[PDB]
Design a protein around this ligand. Structure first.
Ligand SMILES: COc1nc2ccc(Br)cc2cc1[C@@H](c1ccccc1)[C@@](O)(CCN(C)C)c1cccc2ccccc12
Ligand SMILES: COc1nc2ccc(Br)cc2cc1[C@@H](c1ccccc1)[C@@](O)(CCN(C)C)c1cccc2ccccc12
Ligand SMILES: COc1nc2ccc(Br)cc2cc1[C@@H](c1ccccc1)[C@@](O)(CCN(C)C)c1cccc2ccccc12
Ligand SMILES: COc1nc2ccc(Br)cc2cc1[C@@H](c1ccccc1)[C@@](O)(CCN(C)C)c1cccc2ccccc12
Ligand SMILES: COc1nc2ccc(Br)cc2cc1[C@@H](c1ccccc1)[C@@](O)(CCN(C)C)c1cccc2ccccc12
Ligand SMILES: COc1nc2ccc(Br)cc2cc1[C@@H](c1ccccc1)[C@@](O)(CCN(C)C)c1cccc2ccccc12
Ligand SMILES: COc1nc2ccc(Br)cc2cc1[C@@H](c1ccccc1)[C@@](O)(CCN(C)C)c1cccc2ccccc12
Lengths: 40, 81, 207, 41, 81, 81, 81, 81, 81, 81, 81, 81
């Protein structure tokens, strides 16, 4: 049980980090490609 | 008894991981040096250098982690016991 | 282990399903279109750079399936199933099947190109005849290098996630978080490495 | 842990299944799409 | 008895941390050499060069953290025994 | 008895594989330095620089996997026994 | 008895400090080299380069301190007893 | 018993091959770099450089095989056993 | 008896002074290379360029002294004797 | 008895050839690097640059053979048997 | 008996001079490399370049002789004997 | 008996000569590299460069030969015997 408690805490931490730092640039690049397709 | 063999196995696996560590660290550094230097010479080259970079970093790591796959084999699965 | 891989096959298959549903060449692409297209076009620019799409086009599907397969495997390894899931590459069987299939495919394509009587000797003599006996080890190294690497790294995680579990939970959350954070990156990089070295081995196998 | 078993053929079969799925479903429509984007450009 | 395996474990863990520290230091240093020279060459590239630098440092420090983990394994968990 | 021989075989094999990882990593990295720098300083060369690189990496891997090879012989066959 | 463990423990602590010091010296030097060459190429560049440098040093020296801690654990706390 | 003489041998041999691997691994690289960079800078010279290269490796490899040879001598033939 | 402890302690202390001396020599050399080259390329620099040097040397040589101290602690004040 | 001295002899003889092969391989590779990078500039350099290279390779290898000789002296007709 | 401590002492002392000679050779080689490169790129600066090199070497050798002295302390006047 | 110390002595002499040979080879190589590189450029310079190179080697081998000499002390006179 205990290692699961720590695991879920850690998974929340990693999801937090990706959501805050990694997701914005990824989605912005995806949106840039999306709009560049929107040109045609 | 088996204890002698196991002490030897820990020592051997330690040599494996230590050499792999030296190799992988120094190699990843030598590669990152060329990468940083190219990006300093051409700030726009970043999108281009990732290809030759990870070709290197992998072929470098292709030692360390391989050693690691054998390290466990010595420590956790002692041959010839 | 087979179930740990079946989950990844079904996710990738459902993604191909979603693409077959969504694709639009006129309109604005959804996420899945952009991901598929970026992977395909990266590998296509790579193969175009060395062999040319017209001489060895059959490598693109293999490369992309390898990349998605191992990438999804490693990323799924991150999800907090710790307490059944363990990365499949942790088992030699998976990495062996993958690397061995890549080996047999590109070597059989070289044979198909030059012929069964022609490709072995040309591969042995290789780039410089003075290296003829080394090329064999350079040849025999090609498959093994692919396997024990993809194993060695992902296995290195499978143990570590367990070893960290040795901690108490409050200490545990920090090393597990850092490790998985950088394990996403390391798995992605090893997938790119596997696919790119597969492409390069195909290329030099043709010439 | 370096001794294979039948797990091997199972992973080879599932990987080839995914490969067939991809080669038929994914790659053709995306190549057609790349060509059509090069046209509309 | 177990004492011998423990002694082997201390020695092996020492070799692991030794190779780890050699690799980590020399690699972070080579990367820093590239960064220092590039920032000496392009006062403005600082923000772009911090990216490949943290990537290289992340790889080498991953090697060192894996080595540290296997050191804790040898010394405290002492496989076999 | 033969236990000592097994411990020695493991230790020597570990030395082999560790030195192999050191050399292979550093060599692949030094080669990647030239590759990355050439691809940074001229991208048209990407086609040609891949040729000597794998000519050199091959010479480096063809050391690693040779050492590893003998290492297996050390650990699984134990030549002197 | 504990005697063997303690002898191995001293040997391991020494290996740790040794690898650590190799890494630390070589890395601090590789950093000082970029710093010196830059400060030669640009006298007024000091106030920039010290930031990447104390960064690089901070990494390399950290590899030392951690080792210096664990050496104590090996030698002045003797795990496994 | 006489077993000890073999044990050190399996250790000693590793020091011949393992360190040899280092000389093989780095040298094949440091040379290829000078090759690769040449192919980057002076593309027409791809032929000329191959002779200065094959001699360099020709010397480096000359060490490795020799070590390999004596490796077998330690392991299989076991002097003074 | 404790004799084995003193033997291990001398081995460890030698490893500490050894790694320290490797780091010291090679780092002072990598620094002095930047110094010689920087006083060739910019002969007036001698005044400012000594300061960064005294920094990197300060970090390298210190790693030696902290090492040379702990050796003295290993051998003359053996922990755990 | 003689067995222990013989094992020590083979181990020392492994160390000696290992270090020798390391020095020889890396030095020969560096000399080859200078030669290859020089012959890259102007072809007419060949017959000229061969003179210093055979000097460097002459000294570097001059270490190995000498070490190799001492290697035999350790393993054949060992001191103090 | 005293045999074990003398053996450990000799082993440690050899490690001391091994590391010392690695440091000294590679460090003074790098120093001489900078000196040669500078006297090539700037012969007018010859008399300048000799001032730092004697300083640089002075530190490198300053470490090695210090090591040799402690070697005499380990071997002849063994601590703990 | 003195057999134990003799084994330690052979191993220690091996360490002395190994580190010495690593240093000598890599140092002669790094010096010859500067020589070959400063003779590829401006060959009329060569007569200058022989003065510092033979100085640098003079130091490197000054470390090596004396190492060999102390080896002869360990192996043929075995301090503490
Ligand atoms: C910069 O910090 C990092 N970056 C990483 C980057 C990538 C990866 Br994949 C792992 C990284 C891990 C870390 C630390 C860390 C964070 C969490 C848990 C364990 C370790 C670290 O390992 C850094 C030391 N470095 C220089 C060797 C560490 C180890 C031991 C004691 C420390 C004391 C103080 C500070 C850091 C300490
Ligand atoms: C071409 O390379 C060489 N050049 C040399 C130059 C001088 C001298 Br005197 C010996 C040389 C020896 C070789 C090889 C060779 C090829 C064929 C036969 C014998 C030797 C090699 O040594 C490769 C080592 N490399 C990769 C670090 C080797 C040794 C042993 C077993 C091998 C098995 C497979 C491949 C290579 C094998
Ligand atoms: C620059 O120094 C550092 N940088 C770090 C960078 C990152 C991290 Br996370 C930890 C760092 C820690 C330090 C010192 C320190 C400062 C305060 C308390 C404890 C340790 C140090 O450990 C460094 C030794 N170096 C120079 C080989 C030290 C220990 C003992 C005696 C010293 C005597 C003199 C100088 C440094 C001394
Ligand atoms: C380059 O050749 C040399 N240059 C020297 C330069 C200076 C001095 Br002082 C001694 C030198 C000695 C030699 C060789 C030699 C050849 C024949 C007889 C005696 C000595 C060598 O010892 C070199 C080993 N290298 C490659 C690590 C050798 C020994 C054994 C087998 C070899 C097989 C192939 C090539 C060289 C072989
Ligand atoms: C120039 O040499 C030095 N520079 C130093 C620099 C700093 C310091 Br702090 C100590 C230094 C000490 C010396 C010599 C010395 C010895 C005894 C007394 C005084 C000076 C030396 O120990 C150096 C050997 N080197 C290669 C390690 C030596 C010993 C034996 C034979 C030699 C033969 C020839 C030359 C030097 C010889
Ligand atoms: C430059 O010298 C230093 N710089 C340091 C830098 C940082 C720190 Br925190 C400690 C430092 C300490 C010193 C010396 C010292 C020793 C005792 C007391 C005071 C200073 C030194 O320990 C350095 C050895 N080097 C040269 C390998 C030394 C010891 C013995 C003999 C020497 C002979 C000659 C020169 C130095 C000698
Ligand atoms: C180049 O020769 C030197 N230059 C020096 C320069 C400075 C100093 Br302070 C000491 C130097 C010492 C020597 C030789 C020497 C000269 C006279 C007597 C004893 C030893 C040497 O020790 C160097 C070995 N090198 C090449 C790895 C040697 C020993 C044994 C056999 C050799 C065979 C061939 C060549 C050198 C041989």
């Amino acid at each position: 049980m205990s290692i699961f408690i720590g695991q879920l805490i850690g998974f929340a931490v990693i999801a937090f980090i990706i959501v805050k730092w990694v997701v914005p640039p990824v989605r912005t690049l995806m949106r840039n490609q999306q709009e560049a397709v929107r040109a045609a | 008894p088996n204890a002698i063999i196991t002490a030897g196995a820990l020592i051997g696996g330690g040599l494996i991981m230590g050499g792999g560590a030296i190799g992988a660290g120094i190699g990843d550094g030598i590669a990152g040096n060329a990468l940083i230097s190219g990006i300093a010479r051409q700030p726009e080259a970043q999108g281009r250098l990732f290809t030759p970079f990870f070709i290197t970093v992998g072929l470098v790591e292709a030692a360390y982690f391989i050693n690691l796959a054998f390290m466990a084999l010595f420590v956790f699965a002692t041959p010839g016991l | 282990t087979i179930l740990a891989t079946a989950v990844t096959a079904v996710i990738v298959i459902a993604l191909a399903f979603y693409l077959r549903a969504k694709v639009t060449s006129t309109g604005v692409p959804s996420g899945v279109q952009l991901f598929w297209e970026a992977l395909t076009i990266q590998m296509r620019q790579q193969i175009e750079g060395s062999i040319g799409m017209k001489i060895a086009p059959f490598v693109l599907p293999l490369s992309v399936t390898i990349f998605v397969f191992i990438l999804i495997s490693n990323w799924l390894a991150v999800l907090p199933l710790q307490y059944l899931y363990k990365a499949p590459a942790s088992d030699i069987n998976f990495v062996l099947a993958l690397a061995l299939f890549v080996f047999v495919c590109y070597h059989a394509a070289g044979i198909w190109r030059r012929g069964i009587v022609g490709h072995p000797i040309k591969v042995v003599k290789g780039h410089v005849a003075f290296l003829a006996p080394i090329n064999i080890v350079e040849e025999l190294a090609k498959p093994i290098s692919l396997a024990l690497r993809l194993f060695g790294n992902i296995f290195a995680g499978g143990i570590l996630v367990a070893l960290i579990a040795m901690f108490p939970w409050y200490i545990q959350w920090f090393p597990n978080a850092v490790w998985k954070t950088f394990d996403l990156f390391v798995g992605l990089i090893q997938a790119f490495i596997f696919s790119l070295l597969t492409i390069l081995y195909f290329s030099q196998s043709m010439e | 842990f370096l001794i294979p078993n039948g797990t091997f053929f199972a992973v080879l079969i599932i990987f080839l299944i995914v490969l067939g799925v991809i080669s038929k479903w994914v790659v053709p429509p995306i190549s057609k799409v790349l060509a059509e984007r090069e046209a509309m450009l």
